[PDB]
Short mmCIF file of C-alpha atoms in Angstrom, two decimals:
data_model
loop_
_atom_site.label_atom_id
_atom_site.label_comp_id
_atom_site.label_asym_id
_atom_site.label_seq_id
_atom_site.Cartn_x
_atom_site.Cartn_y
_atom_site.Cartn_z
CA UNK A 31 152.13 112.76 29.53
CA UNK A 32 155.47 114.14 28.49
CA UNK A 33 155.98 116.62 31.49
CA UNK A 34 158.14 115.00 33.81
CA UNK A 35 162.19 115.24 33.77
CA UNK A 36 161.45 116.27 29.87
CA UNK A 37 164.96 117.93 29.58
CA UNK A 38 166.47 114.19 30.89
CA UNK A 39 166.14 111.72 28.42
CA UNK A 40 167.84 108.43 27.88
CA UNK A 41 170.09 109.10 24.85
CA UNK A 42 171.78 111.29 26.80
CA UNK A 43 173.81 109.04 28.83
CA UNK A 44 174.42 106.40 26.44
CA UNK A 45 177.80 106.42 24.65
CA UNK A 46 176.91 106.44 20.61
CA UNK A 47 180.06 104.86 19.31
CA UNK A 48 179.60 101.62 21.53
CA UNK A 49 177.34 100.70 18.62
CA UNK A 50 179.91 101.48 15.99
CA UNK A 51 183.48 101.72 16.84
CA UNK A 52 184.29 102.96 13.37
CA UNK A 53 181.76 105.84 13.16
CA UNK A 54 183.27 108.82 12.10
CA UNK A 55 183.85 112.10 13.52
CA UNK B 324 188.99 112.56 25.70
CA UNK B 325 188.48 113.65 29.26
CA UNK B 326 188.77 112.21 32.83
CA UNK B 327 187.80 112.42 36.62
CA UNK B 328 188.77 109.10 39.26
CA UNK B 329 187.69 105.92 37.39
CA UNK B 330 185.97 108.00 34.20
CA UNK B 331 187.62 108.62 31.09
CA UNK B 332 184.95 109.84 28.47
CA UNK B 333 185.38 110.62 24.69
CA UNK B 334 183.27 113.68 23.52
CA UNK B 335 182.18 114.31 19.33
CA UNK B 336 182.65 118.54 19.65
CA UNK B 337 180.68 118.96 16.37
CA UNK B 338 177.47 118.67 18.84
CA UNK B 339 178.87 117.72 22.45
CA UNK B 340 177.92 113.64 22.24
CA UNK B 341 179.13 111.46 24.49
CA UNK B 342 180.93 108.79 22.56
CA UNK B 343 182.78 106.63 24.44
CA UNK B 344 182.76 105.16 27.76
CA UNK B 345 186.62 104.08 28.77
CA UNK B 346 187.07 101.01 31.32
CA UNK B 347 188.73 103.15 32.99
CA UNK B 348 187.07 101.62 36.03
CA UNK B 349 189.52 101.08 39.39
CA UNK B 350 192.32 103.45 37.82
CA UNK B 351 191.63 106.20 40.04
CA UNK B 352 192.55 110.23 39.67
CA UNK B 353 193.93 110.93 36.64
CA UNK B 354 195.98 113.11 36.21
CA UNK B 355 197.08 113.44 32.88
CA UNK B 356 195.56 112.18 28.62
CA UNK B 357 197.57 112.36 25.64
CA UNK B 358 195.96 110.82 22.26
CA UNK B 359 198.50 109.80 19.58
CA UNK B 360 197.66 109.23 15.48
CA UNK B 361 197.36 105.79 16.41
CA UNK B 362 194.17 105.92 18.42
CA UNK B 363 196.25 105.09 21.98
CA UNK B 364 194.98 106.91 24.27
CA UNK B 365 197.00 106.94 27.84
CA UNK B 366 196.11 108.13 31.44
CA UNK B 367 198.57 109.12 33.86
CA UNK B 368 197.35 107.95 37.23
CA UNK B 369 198.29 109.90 40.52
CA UNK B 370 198.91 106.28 42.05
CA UNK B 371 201.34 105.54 38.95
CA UNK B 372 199.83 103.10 36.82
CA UNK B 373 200.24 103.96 33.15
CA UNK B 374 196.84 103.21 31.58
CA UNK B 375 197.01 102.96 27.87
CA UNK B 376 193.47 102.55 25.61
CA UNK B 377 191.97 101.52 22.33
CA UNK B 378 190.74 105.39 21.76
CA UNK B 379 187.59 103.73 19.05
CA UNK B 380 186.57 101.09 21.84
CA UNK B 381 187.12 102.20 24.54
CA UNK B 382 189.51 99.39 25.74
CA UNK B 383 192.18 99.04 28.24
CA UNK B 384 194.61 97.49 26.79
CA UNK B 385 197.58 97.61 28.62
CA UNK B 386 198.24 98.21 32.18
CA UNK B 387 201.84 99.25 33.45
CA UNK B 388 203.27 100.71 37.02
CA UNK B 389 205.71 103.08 36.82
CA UNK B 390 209.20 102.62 39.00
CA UNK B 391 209.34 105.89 41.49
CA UNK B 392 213.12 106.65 41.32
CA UNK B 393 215.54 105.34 44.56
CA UNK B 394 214.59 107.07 48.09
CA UNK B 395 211.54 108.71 46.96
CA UNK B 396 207.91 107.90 48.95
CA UNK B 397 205.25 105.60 48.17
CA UNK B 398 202.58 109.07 46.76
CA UNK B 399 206.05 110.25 44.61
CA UNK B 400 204.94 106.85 42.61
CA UNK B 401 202.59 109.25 40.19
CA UNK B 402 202.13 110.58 36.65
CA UNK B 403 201.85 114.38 36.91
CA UNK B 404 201.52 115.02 33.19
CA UNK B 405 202.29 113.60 29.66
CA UNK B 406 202.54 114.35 25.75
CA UNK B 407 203.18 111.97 22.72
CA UNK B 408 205.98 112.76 20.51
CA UNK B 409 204.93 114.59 17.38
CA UNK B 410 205.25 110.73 15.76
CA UNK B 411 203.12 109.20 18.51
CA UNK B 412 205.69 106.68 18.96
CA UNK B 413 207.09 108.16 22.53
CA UNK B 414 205.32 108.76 25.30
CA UNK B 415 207.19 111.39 27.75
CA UNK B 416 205.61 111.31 31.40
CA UNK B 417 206.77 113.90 34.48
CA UNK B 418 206.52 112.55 37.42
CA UNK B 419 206.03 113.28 41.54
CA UNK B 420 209.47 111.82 41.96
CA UNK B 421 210.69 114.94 39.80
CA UNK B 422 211.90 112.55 36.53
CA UNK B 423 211.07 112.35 33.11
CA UNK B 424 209.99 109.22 31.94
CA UNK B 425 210.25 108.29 27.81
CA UNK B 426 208.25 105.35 26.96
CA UNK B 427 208.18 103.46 23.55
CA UNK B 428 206.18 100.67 21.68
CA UNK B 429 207.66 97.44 21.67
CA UNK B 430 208.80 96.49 18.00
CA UNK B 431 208.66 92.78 18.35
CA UNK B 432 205.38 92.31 19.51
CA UNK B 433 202.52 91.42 16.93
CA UNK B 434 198.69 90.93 17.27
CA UNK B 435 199.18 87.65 18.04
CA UNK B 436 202.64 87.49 20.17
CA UNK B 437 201.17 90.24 22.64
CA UNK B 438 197.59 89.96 22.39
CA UNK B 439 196.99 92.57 25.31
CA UNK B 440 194.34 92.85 27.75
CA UNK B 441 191.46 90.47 26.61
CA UNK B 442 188.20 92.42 25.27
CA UNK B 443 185.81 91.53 27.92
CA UNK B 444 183.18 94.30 28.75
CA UNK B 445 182.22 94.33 32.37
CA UNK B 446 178.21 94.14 32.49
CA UNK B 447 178.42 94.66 36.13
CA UNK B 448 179.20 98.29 35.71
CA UNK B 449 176.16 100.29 33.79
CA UNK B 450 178.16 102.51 31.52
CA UNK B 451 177.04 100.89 28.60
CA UNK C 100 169.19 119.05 52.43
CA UNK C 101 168.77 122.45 51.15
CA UNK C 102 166.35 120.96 48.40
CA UNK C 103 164.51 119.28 50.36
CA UNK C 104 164.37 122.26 52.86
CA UNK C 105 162.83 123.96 50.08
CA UNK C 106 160.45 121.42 49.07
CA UNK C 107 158.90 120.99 52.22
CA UNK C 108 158.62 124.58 52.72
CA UNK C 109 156.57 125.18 50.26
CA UNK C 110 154.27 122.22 50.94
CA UNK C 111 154.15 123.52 54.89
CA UNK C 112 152.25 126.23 53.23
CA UNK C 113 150.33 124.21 50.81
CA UNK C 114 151.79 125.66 48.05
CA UNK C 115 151.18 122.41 46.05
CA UNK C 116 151.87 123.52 42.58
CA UNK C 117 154.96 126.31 43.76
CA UNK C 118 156.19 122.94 45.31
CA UNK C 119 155.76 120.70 42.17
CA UNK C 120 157.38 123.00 40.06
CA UNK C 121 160.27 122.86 42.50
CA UNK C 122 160.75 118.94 42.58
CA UNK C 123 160.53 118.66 38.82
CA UNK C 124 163.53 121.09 38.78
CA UNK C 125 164.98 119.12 41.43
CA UNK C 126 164.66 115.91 39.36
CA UNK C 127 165.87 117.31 36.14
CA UNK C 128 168.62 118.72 37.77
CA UNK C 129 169.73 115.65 39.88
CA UNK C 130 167.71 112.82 37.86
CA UNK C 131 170.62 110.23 39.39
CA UNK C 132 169.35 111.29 43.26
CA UNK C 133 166.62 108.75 44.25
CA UNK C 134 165.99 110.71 47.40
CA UNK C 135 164.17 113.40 45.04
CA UNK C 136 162.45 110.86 43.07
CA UNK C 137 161.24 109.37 46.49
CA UNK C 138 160.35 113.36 47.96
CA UNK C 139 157.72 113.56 44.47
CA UNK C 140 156.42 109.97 44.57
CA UNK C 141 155.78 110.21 48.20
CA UNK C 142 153.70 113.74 47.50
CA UNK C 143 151.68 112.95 44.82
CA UNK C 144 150.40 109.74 46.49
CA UNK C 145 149.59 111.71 49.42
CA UNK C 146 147.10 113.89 47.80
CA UNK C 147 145.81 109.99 46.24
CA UNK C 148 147.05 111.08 42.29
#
């Protein structure tokens, strides 16, 4: 099951230009 | 760009992601960000250390203490608050020991004469 | 403390499901604070789920 913490999720702390400096904004 | 002691974070406002992580790690409270057209991105530490970043990366790049002017304490040693010219290529700083500081880029240096603070991301820390 | 307060409140009553409600908030509000993590593990394998 799905219940648990299911507002806190992983993505959410992980920075998503460290993948791609050059991504744009 | 925002900051708390040791954390300087870059934020997309379209939706509120967290982009960036700075190694902004050991710098302490901030006091002050300013961004320039160039990507730099420099923190004013309340101990004094000028902290200037690769705003893309992340990346310290440079590291420099500031000189607290004669007969002031030790804590006057500290950036209160900072704005780049409107060319980005001066930095003006107030400071605890009531001056304002004007900082520049250094003309003669290249990629290669001052390569900066190496590119080296600490795994020990888990802001990856 | 005051969390935990709570927590074990509710279980002193055997409110079991008013006090699981209350340490899922307590996770998804602090997810970083083992201590709560610990408090929920630590009930559910009391009652053996």
């Amino acid at each position: 099951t799905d219940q648990i913490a299911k507002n806190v999720k992983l993505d959410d702390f992980i920075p998503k230009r460290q993948s791609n400096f050059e991504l744009s904004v | 760009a925002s900051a708390c002691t040791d954390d300087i974070r870059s934020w997309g406002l379209a939706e509120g992601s967290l982009l960036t992580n700075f190694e902004s790690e050991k710098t302490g409270i901030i006091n002050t960000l300013s961004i320039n057209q160039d990507d730099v991105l420099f923190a004013g530490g309340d101990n004094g250390v000028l902290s200037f970043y690769d705003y893309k990366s992340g990346h310290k790049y440079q590291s420099l203490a500031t000189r607290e002017m004669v007969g002031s304490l030790e804590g006057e040693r500290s950036v209160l608050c900072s704005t780049f010219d409107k060319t980005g290529l001066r930095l003006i700083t107030g400071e605890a020991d009531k001056s304002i500081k004007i900082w520049k880029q250094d003309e003669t240096a290249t990629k290669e004469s001052e390569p900066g603070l190496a590119w080296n991301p600490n795994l020990s820390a888990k802001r990856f | 403390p005051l969390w935990i307060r709570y927590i074990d409140a509710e279980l002193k009553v055997k409110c079991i499901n008013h006090a699981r409600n209350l340490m899922n908030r307590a996770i998804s509000t602090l997810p970083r604070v083992d201590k709560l993590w610990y408090k929920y593990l630590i009930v559910e394998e009391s009652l053996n789920n």
